[PDB]
Symmetry: C3
């Protein structure tokens, strides 16, 4: 049998808080419609921002190019086991550092789009 999807895509982009306001302004200035979700990174257990951007298929590439050009790689660290916290500040000799990328982006197919 046979199926298709609609003309809209749903972009889900996880970005760093430090890059969020910058991205949001660029997107809405370019007439993109955005919903923002306050999220937490699973590895760093720290706040980040997820943007949900429903876009016509013909504008997906422009949205992606704005997201790509917006962000910056940053180094962050995993928070040590915190029962003693007043010394964990003092510690970590070999910080578990990770590089956080500008954006992790999913472009999802959409069966139906409605504005009610």
């Amino acid at each position: 049998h046979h199926h298709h999807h609609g003309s809209m895509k749903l972009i889900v982009a996880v970005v760093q808080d430090q890059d969020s306001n910058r991205l949001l302004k660029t997107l809405t200035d370019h007439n993109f419609r955005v919903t923002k979700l306050a999220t937490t990174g699973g590895f760093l257990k720290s706040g980040n921002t997820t943007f949900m951007i429903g876009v016509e298929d013909i504008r997906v590439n422009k949205a992606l190019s704005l997201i790509k050009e917006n962000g910056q790689k940053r180094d962050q660290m995993i928070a040590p086991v915190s029962p003693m916290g007043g010394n964990a500040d003092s510690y970590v000799p070999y910080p578990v550092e990770v590089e956080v990328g500008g954006a992790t982006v999913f472009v999802l197919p959409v069966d139906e789009f409605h504005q009610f």
Copy 2:
């Protein structure tokens, strides 16, 4: 080659806070299952509510009709540049007004649905 999707759909509906409790009650009263996300509108930079509703394909239209009948258009304004806020109250001669719709809704295909 050939693929299909499952019988479930994932409805993602962005609604106004003022209409949220009303919608939620209607949905769960009609045996729909709902997860609520506290979100922010990208343009107004204000709180709104996103409902995630996983629905059998055969009940999608009923869910959509409840969402459609629930909401109301409302006017809102963009908050002016706030460094001086004590006068921004005083200002805005030509308020940038927008009309917020009852619901923006995405119906997503789902490859697998599991209840563990």
Copy 3:
């Protein structure tokens, strides 16, 4: 006409807060990448946790098996009408109890995946 989707899937898993930290540790220990959303159950009107896990199709089953083995069924109750709250504590003779499952999981197709 003809379409396909990409090799990535987006897993959306709604779990209980009591099982969240346990699941997160297991997932990231197994090299899965996770974004966490603080959500609310529509029926219980209480906090729960939604994990968004973008996974290569070839690792989906492993992710699902970790999610499945992680959770536990728990009983919860619907909060009574609260205008008098100081007696609603006193009340509810026939508590509306529900069984909350370990995880409700959607595996979504993904058209494009980008790391910028």
